[PDB]
């Protein structure tokens, strides 16, 4: 995150850390949606062009974190996976359209003050919130500038931008399973996710049931916090039925 802030303890109970066993690097971010499932960006696992192709036992999932680096000894939970599900039509060759995957943790995790699932939106919910001008919140441990690494979880609240503006800011083909958010070079504030944030959650707070809903997944952006450039997130509600379908189908 760029021009963010540090997250208060327990601010993002559902924020997950995708981590490789060897070397011991933070691959990407993620989110807890059940006691058995983590939701991420497909391109965190699978990205042929950079020879990326991770497996079940190449990664570990660290829930409950706050410090980026430290093994938070009594607070955090480290879980083994059991099965990565990429969308069937993730488009890694063209524009990363349908950048969404599901993880089945080896065993359920237990909730705490610091570990807690985020809701998945419903049509009416996606339908009253996913409106330009409305702010959402991104969380992560990624670079602090395009180009350096945070001590603690970072946070930044961004506006949703009308699709015409997102479209006219890139030469990349923008699909329906995508939304963009950020400030325009003029609104006077800034911030945006960056490398290391992908897989991470874009969440909104319901003004109706005071609940938190994940509306997007940090996807891509040309750079991090460049003027007249916005971040692109996977539209979780549009990929909804697929998501249900795998949890139930399995």
């Amino acid at each position: 995150i760029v021009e963010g802030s540090d997250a208060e303890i327990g601010m993002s109970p559902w924020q997950v850390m995708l981590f490789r066993k060897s070397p011991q690097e933070l691959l990407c971010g993620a989110s807890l949606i059940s006691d058995r499932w983590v939701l991420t960006a497909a391109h965190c696992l699978l990205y042929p062009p950079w020879d990326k192709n991770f497996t079940e036992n190449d990664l570990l999932v660290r829930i409950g974190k706050h410090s980026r680096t430290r093994y938070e000894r009594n607070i955090e939970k480290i879980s083994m996976l059991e099965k990565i599900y990429i969308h069937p039509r993730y488009n890694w060759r063209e524009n990363l359209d349908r950048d969404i995957a599901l993880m089945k943790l080896k065993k359920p995790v237990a909730f705490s003050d610091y570990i807690h699932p985020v809701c998945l939106p419903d049509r009416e919910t996606a339908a009253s919130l996913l409106q330009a001008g409305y702010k959402g919140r991104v969380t992560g441990w990624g670079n602090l500038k395009e180009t350096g690494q945070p001590s603690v979880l970072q946070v930044v609240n961004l506006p949703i931008v009308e699709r015409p503006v997102c479209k006219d800011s890139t030469r990349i083909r923008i699909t329906d399973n995508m939304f963009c958010a950020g400030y325009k070079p003029d609104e006077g504030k800034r911030g945006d996710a960056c490398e290391g944030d992908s897989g991470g959650p874009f969440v909104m707070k319901s003004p109706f049931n005071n609940r938190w809903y994940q509306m997007g997944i940090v996807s891509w952006g040309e750079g991090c916090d460049r003027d007249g450039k916005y971040g692109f997130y996977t539209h979780v509600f549009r990929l909804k039925k697929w998501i249900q379908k795998v949890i139930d189908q399995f």
Binding site: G10, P117, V118, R137, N157, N210
Partner: peptide
């Protein structure tokens, strides 16, 4: 799915410091 009510905020009726930004744009 007791989802999206944080133990340390909503459940104690405690707010984080930038959540009112969010709500004020709705």
């Amino acid at each position: 799915a007791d989802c999206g009510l944080r133990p340390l905020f909503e459940k104690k009726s405690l707010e984080d410091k930038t959540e009112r930004e969010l709500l004020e744009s709705y």
